[PDB]
Amino acid sequence: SMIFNVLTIFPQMFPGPLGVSNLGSALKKGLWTLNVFDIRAFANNKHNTVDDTPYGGGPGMLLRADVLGRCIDEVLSLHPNTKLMFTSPRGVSFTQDIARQTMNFDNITLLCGRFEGIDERVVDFYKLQEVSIGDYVLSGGELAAMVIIDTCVRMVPGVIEYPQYTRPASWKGMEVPEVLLTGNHGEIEKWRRNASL
Amino acid sequence: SMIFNVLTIFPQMFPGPLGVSNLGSALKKGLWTLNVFDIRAFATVDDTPYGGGPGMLLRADVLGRCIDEVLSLHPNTKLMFTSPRGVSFTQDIARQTMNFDNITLLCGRFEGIDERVVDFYKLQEVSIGDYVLSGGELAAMVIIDTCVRMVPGVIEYPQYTRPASWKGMEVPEVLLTGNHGEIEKWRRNASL
């Protein structure tokens, strides 16, 4: 069973899109496992704070190393060989091929940043692998984690170019390419290859 | 208010991540608007493809009824469809998308959609990255979060906060000096 551990201050977002259709049923059959750790539960402080203002000035807030360290050490005690990742803009560009390389690991941990990010000592101490799902700024790392997990889980055994058409044969005066209705396997294959280029 | 219309066979997924924190509170106070159209209400929505092939395909007639309804309500909406063949979504493309006050995101499922829908409506195809997802919903969320963040009112160096020492690792001392000039220099130099 491929195991994903997601570290978030918004545990209630999950499984969200991951609980639907093939992902969701594979999750119920135990072909993959989703552990969603609530970062706020490891705060262990007055007011229960996960974040604070950055040293040196600057706006916004930053996830604290001590809080994140407690969450991550708990994950590591449970999964000593997990691959620790972190959703961020300066990461490696996530691609189908990066997803396949990730598949070499049976245990992945996705730390989701919020606010202005995380204390950098966390990145360096744990040697987090930074991953970016694209060149755009999101509100936090959760959607990025969901993107990565969907991509990867689709490749777990047992889980799962040319234009396509289905009924009706005519819709708003627009007709399906006729070759598709001939049952002519050779012409259909030829048509599909040429429509693909 | 900036309007997003999402067309999906999984309306129950929304708002989801878009209903949390700043996005969620901006939504509740009306800085932006999320209309989630259930494609299934305008029908079976999917059928086997002409010519053979695995899987199913969302039907043109069903999608057309849903899209035509969206168009009667928002005649000037920018029609978009999330798909692997699309333009690469980037911060720049998000800024260009902002030039429209009204955006519609059709989310594909199964093996995709009937191609006449793409051509009749001239859907702008958008891809959030070079990877295959289970459907267009997460791509719609990424696009919406990205865009909504730039609506007024809604909202590279290493950073550090307390404690000053953690597992024997100290915060760079310059950040604790209150020395604005040296902090600026240090942040400039660490951004390379």
Chain B interface includes A20 (CB < 8 A): yes
Residue B86 dihedral angles phi and psi, to the nearest 5° = -70, 170
CB contact under 8 A, A121 and B169: yes
DSSP character at residue B88:
E
Contact (Cβ atoms closer than 8 angstroms) between residue B87 and residue B124? yes
Is residue A106 within 8 A of residue A2, CB to CB? The reply is yes
Question: Which residue in chain B has the smallest CA separation from A121?
Answer: B169
Cα–Cα distances (Å) from B73 to B37, B64, B122, in that order, read 12, 14, 18
Interchain pair B145, A143: CB under 8 A: yes
Mutation target among A96, A115, A165, A184 for the B interface, most CBs of B within 10 A:
A165
- Sign of the CA dihedral running A33, A83, B146, B124: negative
Q: Which of residues 31-60 of A touch B (CB under 8 A)?
A: 51-58
| β-strand pairing of A83-93 with A129-132 | parallel
The answer to whether the CB atoms of A164 and B135 lie below 8 A apart is no
Catalogue all structural domains in chain A, each as residue range(s) with its CATH number: 1-161 (3.40.1280.10), 162-197 (1.10.1270.20)
Residues A167 and A176: their CA atoms lie apart, in Å, by 9
Q: What contacts A15, CB < 8 A, 6 or more positions away? A: A23, A24, A27, A34, A36
Q: Which residues pair with B126 in a beta bridge?
A: B87
Per-residue DSSP letter, A13: G
What does the alpha-carbon distance between residue B151 and residue A59 come to, in Å, rounded to a whole number?
Answer: 19
Q: Are A115 and B181 in contact (CB under 8 A)?
A: no
- CA-based nearest distance B160→chain A, Å: 5
Chain A residue with the nearest C-alpha to that of B128: A134
- Euclidean distance between the first and final Cα of chain B, in Å? 39
Chain B: residue whose CA lies nearest to A185: B51
Kindly state whether B175 is in contact with chain A, defined as any CB-CB distance less than 8 angstroms: yes
Please report the DSSP string for A92-150 in residue order. Answer: EEP-HHHHHHHTT-SEEEEEEP-TT-B-HHHHHHHTPEEEESSSS--SSSHHHHHHHHH
Cβ distance of B138 and A143 shorter than 8 Å: yes
A 106-145 → B contacts, CB under 8 A: 114, 116-121, 123-125, 133-140, 142-143
Q: Which of B16, B48, B60 sits opposite A16 (nearest CB)?
A: B16
Report the greatest alpha carbon distance in chain B: 71
Give the integer Cα–Cα distance in Å for A48 and A89: 28
Provide the shortest C-alpha distance from residue A28 to chain B (in Å). 17
CA distance A121 to chain B (A): 7
Q: Work out how many CB contacts closer than 8 A connect A with B.
A: 216
The helix or strand, by DSSP H or E, that contains position A78, with its residue range, turns out to be helix A65-78
CA angle A46, A51, A52 (to 5 degrees): 90
Nearest to A119 among B94, B114, B160 (CB): B160
d(CA A129, CA A148): 13
- Phi-psi region for residue A66, left (φ > 0), alpha (ψ -120 to 50) or beta? alpha
Q: Where would I find the H helices in B85-157? A: 91-98, 115-121, 137-148
Instruction: Tell me if B130 is assigned to a ligand binding site.
Output: yes
The Cα–Cα gap between B118 and B165 comes to: 57
Given a contact cutoff of 8 angstroms between Cβ atoms, the answer to whether B8 and B37 are in contact is yes
Those of residues 154-173 in B touching chain A at CB distance below 8 A are 156, 158-164, 166-167, 169, 171
Query: Which residues are within 8 A (CB) of A24 and not within 5 positions of it... i.e. 6 or more apart?
Result: A15, A18
Q: SS3 of A166, please?
A: coil
